[PDB]
Design a protein around this ligand. Structure first.
Ligand code: HEM
Length: 82
């Protein structure tokens, strides 16, 4: 289904926020810091399927069971949030 739909079925909208700061960096904000990358949604998918720290803060994102294609839409979904 749509990318956002995935954010709810996996729980991505639980620690993140299209703009408000919660457990992780806002979604749109994430694109503001990585903006300029030649494909940050692809690597974002590799870091979204395994999660990790040294990314935004000392709180490594818990790895999710999102297939590679689902984590790819999850990456472009964050940079496309509102
Ligand atoms: C499957 C749903 C989720 C998606 C699509 C998603 C996506 C992302 C992306 C693209 C990053 C970059 C991390 C990196 O580059 O390694 C990230 C970071 C982060 N996510 Fe998520 N996330 C999801 C669920 C969660 C959940 C459930 C939590 C809270 C338990 C969470 C907490 C964080 C934190 C804290 C960061 C910042 C990186 C750090 O501090 O280590 N995420 N997430």
């Amino acid at each position: 289904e749509d990318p956002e739909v995935l954010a709810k079925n996996k729980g991505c909208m639980a620690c993140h926020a299209i703009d408000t700061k919660m457990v992780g960096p806002a979604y749109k904000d994430v694109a503001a810091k990585y903006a300029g990358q030649a494909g940050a949604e692809a690597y974002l998918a590799q870091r979204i399927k395994n999660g990790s720290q040294g990314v935004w803060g000392p709180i490594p994102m818990p790895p999710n069971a999102v297939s590679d294609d689902e984590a790819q839409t999850l990456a472009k979904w964050i940079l496309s949030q509102k």
